[PDB]
RNA sequence: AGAGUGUAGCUUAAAAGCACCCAACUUACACUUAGGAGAUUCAAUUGACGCUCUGA
């Protein structure tokens, strides 16, 4: 039941690209985050 | 009017990983991404590529590629956590890391004298105390470990009636945070059971009415 | 007419209770009606903080449609300004140079009036069962200022 | 004082000459229409499933409450009300890859 | 084993009116617009395939 709020869409009129970037927390888990600049790994200390 | 005091304790475990994705949802995500691309405008990467290539061509007729190559290299070097966890075991059914996609309910097998079925861990309450207190006490004694069973409310779930002297069963659920089960090699038949396995294990009607209020997902 | 049997037929303000009060600055919240055999909690405050904005907006829309279809009154749902955070990055062979990154963080707030024990527990178990990936729930109190 | 954040920045009006055109075809439009119809049907099915599950849970809770009331005219006064425990309640979302 | 039953979630309706979701506006709710899926369980007022209750 976690796919009801997955297929989303930016309802704003003027906006830039939001590439599905991944981020790992202080344990070891990725998450698809819609953010600019097509990065691949975000090492957040 | 004699009434035998019993109860019940059903465990609720939140899922860790999400359910698998269907092809129609994949096509829907693809078309939504295409619509997002067609609606988006003036991005940082788009400019940093286009105007940079234009400046390169201009100063050559008289960055971005290496950056994305380094990004791809860092993505290929870093290996994510292997989601394959429900297929590499296929034997340790009483483990916490068995199923991590759905909800899991715990039950303990106990063979009595007149009854020989697989009943959910009951909870005997006393008139001198309350009901939720006795329920959580029985849950802590039958678990012999350090767990955090956060109850979602004082209201019950489902009740039954069996006689031979009357009796009654009080169902109580509690959300589990972390799993610090001490000594997983106990002789108690406490197995982490989900939904289909739960419906397949039970047999009588007293347990068939439990799968109607649990989170079927 | 007052004496005719058709008296009081054009009355209409008795069927409404909206007296057009100043609800923009009024801080009068309903208390938790406690009695024992009939429990009723006041106004809560659900928080859906995450790193993505569209996911939070979709979750807020979903929960608002759900609480609208479940026949429960809704106070007001607003949004707080985002907080920019920098992500320092240290160089590999040089643990002395630091960099910086940019990421977003949004949060939504929804409130529900009547929450009886059974109804509220069913609502919260449905919310936690259908909790999407990314966002997180952290219900607080109604005394959260901005 | 709430600070508005949905206001678009000033860098969203000086540049707007990149991808103004959108080209498609009749096949793409009919495929998108079929996909939207299938997704609407799937959402309706999921909504009906959630509705019947909620109805089943509600009727089970009502049966349990009425049985507890008819079997004990005292435990209902302490079982209906809720003790102060879910005030700082929190539930973090699921994960993708295990630690 | 007995009883109550019988048009999708509803009908002192006989294949309709209320309901649901998706796409556009909205911080959000909501109106509106543009669309979709829905039923008389069987053989001629009768008997039996589905649900509930009373039991063991």
From Swiss-Prot, chain A:
Localization in the cell: Mitochondrion
Family, similarity comment: Belongs to the mitochondrion-specific ribosomal protein mL55 family.
Subunit structure comment from the entry: Component of the mitochondrial large ribosomal subunit (mt-LSU). Mature mammalian 55S mitochondrial ribosomes consist of a small (28S) and a large (39S) subunit. The 28S small subunit contains a 12S ribosomal RNA (12S mt-rRNA) and 30 different proteins. The 39S large subunit contains a 16S rRNA (16S mt-rRNA), a copy of mitochondrial valine transfer RNA (mt-tRNA(Val)), which plays an integral structural role, and 52 different proteins.
Name by which UniProt lists this protein: Large ribosomal subunit protein mL55
Natural source organism: Homo sapiens (Human)
Entire protein: shown range: 34 to 78 of 128
Swiss-Prot record, chain B:
Sites bearing N6-acetyllysine, chain numbering: 168
One BP term from GO: mitochondrial translation
Record GO terms (molecular function): structural constituent of ribosome
A GO CC term assigned to this protein in UniProt: mitochondrial large ribosomal subunit
Alphabetized UniProt keyword annotations: Acetylation, Mitochondrion, Ribonucleoprotein, Ribosomal protein, Transit peptide
Compartment list: Mitochondrion
Source organism superkingdom: Eukaryota
Chloroplast listed as a keyword: no
Subunit record text: Component of the mitochondrial large ribosomal subunit (mt-LSU). Mature mammalian 55S mitochondrial ribosomes consist of a small (28S) and a large (39S) subunit. The 28S small subunit contains a 12S ribosomal RNA (12S mt-rRNA) and 30 different proteins. The 39S large subunit contains a 16S rRNA (16S mt-rRNA), a copy of mitochondrial valine transfer RNA (mt-tRNA(Val)), which plays an integral structural role, and 52 different proteins. mL46 is located at the central protuberance.
Family per similarity comment: Belongs to the mitochondrion-specific ribosomal protein mL46 family.
UniProt-recorded name of the protein: Large ribosomal subunit protein mL46
Full protein stretch here: 43 to 279 of 279
Curated annotation (Swiss-Prot), chain C:
Keyword Chloroplast assigned: no
Localization annotation: Mitochondrion
Domain of life (superkingdom): Eukaryota
GO cellular component: mitochondrial inner membrane; mitochondrial large ribosomal subunit; mitochondrial ribosome; mitochondrion
First-listed, main subcellular location of the protein, grouped into a coarse class: mitochondrion
UniProt keyword list: Mitochondrion, Ribonucleoprotein, Ribosomal protein, Transit peptide
GO terms (BP aspect): mitochondrial translation
Parts of the chain that traverse the membrane: none
Stated family: Belongs to the mitochondrion-specific ribosomal protein mL48 family.
Subunit record text: Component of the mitochondrial large ribosomal subunit (mt-LSU). Mature mammalian 55S mitochondrial ribosomes consist of a small (28S) and a large (39S) subunit. The 28S small subunit contains a 12S ribosomal RNA (12S mt-rRNA) and 30 different proteins. The 39S large subunit contains a 16S rRNA (16S mt-rRNA), a copy of mitochondrial valine transfer RNA (mt-tRNA(Val)), which plays an integral structural role, and 52 different proteins. mL48 is located at the central protuberance. Interacts with OXA1L.
Listed name of the protein: Large ribosomal subunit protein mL48
UniProt gene name: MRPL48
Portion of the parent chain present: 48 to 193 of 212
Curated annotation (Swiss-Prot), chain D:
Subunit comment: Component of the mitochondrial large ribosomal subunit (mt-LSU). Mature mammalian 55S mitochondrial ribosomes consist of a small (28S) and a large (39S) subunit. The 28S small subunit contains a 12S ribosomal RNA (12S mt-rRNA) and 30 different proteins. The 39S large subunit contains a 16S rRNA (16S mt-rRNA), a copy of mitochondrial valine transfer RNA (mt-tRNA(Val)), which plays an integral structural role, and 52 different proteins. mL40 binds to the major groove of the anticodon stem of mt-tRNA(Val) in the central protuberance.
Tissue expression notes: Ubiquitous.
Transmembrane segments: none
Keyword terms, alphabetized: Mitochondrion, Ribonucleoprotein, Ribosomal protein, Transit peptide
Parent-record interval covered: 83 to 181 of 206
Any single biological process term in GO: mitochondrial translation
Subcellular location(s) per record: Mitochondrion
Primary localisation category: mitochondrion
Disulfide cysteine pairs (residue numbers): none
One MF annotation (Gene Ontology) recorded for this entry: RNA binding
GO cellular component: mitochondrial inner membrane; mitochondrial large ribosomal subunit; mitochondrial ribosome; mitochondrion; nucleolus; nucleus
Family: Belongs to the mitochondrion-specific ribosomal protein mL40 family.
Name of the protein: Large ribosomal subunit protein mL40
Source organism per UniProt: Homo sapiens (Human)
């Amino acid at each position: 039941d976690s796919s009801r709020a997955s297929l989303t869409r930016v309802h704003r009129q003027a906006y830039a690209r939001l590439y599905p970037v991944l981020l790992v927390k202080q344990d070891g888990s990725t998450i698809h985050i819609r953010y600019r600049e097509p990065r691949r790994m975000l090492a957040m200390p | 009017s004699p009434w035998r005091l019993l109860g019940a304790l059903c465990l609720q475990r939140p899922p860790v990983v999400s359910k698998p994705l269907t092809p129609l949802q994949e096509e829907m995500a693809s078309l939504l991404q295409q619509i997002e691309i067609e609606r988006s405008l003036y991005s940082d990467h788009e400019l940093r590529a286009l105007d940079e290539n234009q400046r390169l061509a201009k100063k050559k007729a008289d960055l971005a590629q290496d950056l994305e190559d380094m990004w791809e290299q860092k993505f290929l070097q870093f290996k994510l956590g292997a989601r394959i966890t429900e297929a590499d075991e296929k034997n340790d059914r009483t483990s916490l890391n068995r199923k991590l996609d759905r909800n899991l309910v715990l039950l303990v097998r106990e063979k009595f004298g007149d009854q020989d079925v697989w009943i959910l861990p009951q909870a005997e309450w006393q008139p001198g105390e309350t009901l939720r207190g006795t329920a959580e006490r029985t849950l802590a004694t039958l678990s012999e470990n350090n767990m955090e069973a956060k109850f979602l409310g004082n209201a019950p779930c489902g009740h039954y009636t069996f006689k031979f002297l009357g009796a009654k069963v009080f169902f109580f659920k509690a959300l589990l945070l972390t799993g610090d089960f001490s000594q997983a090699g106990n002789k108690g038949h406490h197995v982490w059971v989900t939904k289909d396995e739960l419906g397949d294990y039970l047999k009588p009607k007293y347990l068939a009415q439990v799968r109607r209020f649990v989170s079927d997902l | 007419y007052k004496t005719k049997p058709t008296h009081g037929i054009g009355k209409y303000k008795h069927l409404i209770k909206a007296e057009e009060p100043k609800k923009k600055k009024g801080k009068v919240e309903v208390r938790a009606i406690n009695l024992g055999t009939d429990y009723e909690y006041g106004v809560l405050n659900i928080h859906l903080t995450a790193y993505d904005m569209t996911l939070a907006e979709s979750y807020a829309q979903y929960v608002h449609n759900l609480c609208n279809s479940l026949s429960i009154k809704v106070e007001e749902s607003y949004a707080m300004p985002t907080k920019t955070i920098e992500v320092l990055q240290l160089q590999d062979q040089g643990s002395k140079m630091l960099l910086d990154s940019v990421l977003t963080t949004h949060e939504r707030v929804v409130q529900i009036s009547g929450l009886s024990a059974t109804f509220a527990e069913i609502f919260l178990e449905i919310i936690q069962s259908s909790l999407p990936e990314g966002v997180r729930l952290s219900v607080k109190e109604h005394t959260e200022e901005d | 004082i709430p600070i508005e954040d949905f206001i678009t920045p000033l860098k969203f009006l000086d540049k707007a000459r990149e991808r103004p055109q959108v080209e498609l075809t009749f096949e793409e439009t009919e495929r998108r229409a079929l996909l939207l119809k299938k997704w609407s049907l799937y959402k309706q099915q999921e909504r009906k499933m959630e509705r019947d599950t909620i109805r089943a849970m509600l009727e089970a809770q009502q049966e349990a409450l009425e049985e507890l009331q008819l079997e004990s005219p005292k435990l209902h006064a302490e079982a209906i009300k809720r003790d102060p425990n879910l005030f700082p309640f929190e539930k973090e979302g699921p994960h993708y890859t295990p630690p």
